[PDB]
Amino acid sequence: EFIPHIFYSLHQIRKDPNNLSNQLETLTGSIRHRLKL
């Protein structure tokens, strides 16, 4: 399953941009992983 994970990661992006760049980069990498699969 990639759909709910994409949804959720999308929402903690749009909820907390104030996270340090580390979390943003890691989470974007996670979304790139899910759409790659």
């Binding site: 974007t28 979304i31 790139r32 759409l35």
Partner: peptide, 27 residues
Amino acid sequence: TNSEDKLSKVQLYEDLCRYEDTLSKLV
């Protein structure tokens, strides 16, 4: 060879395509 032509004919293929493009722009 006609398989990919049939696949490109249905809209949701284009949908996944520009969804990938939009995430590429976002990243």
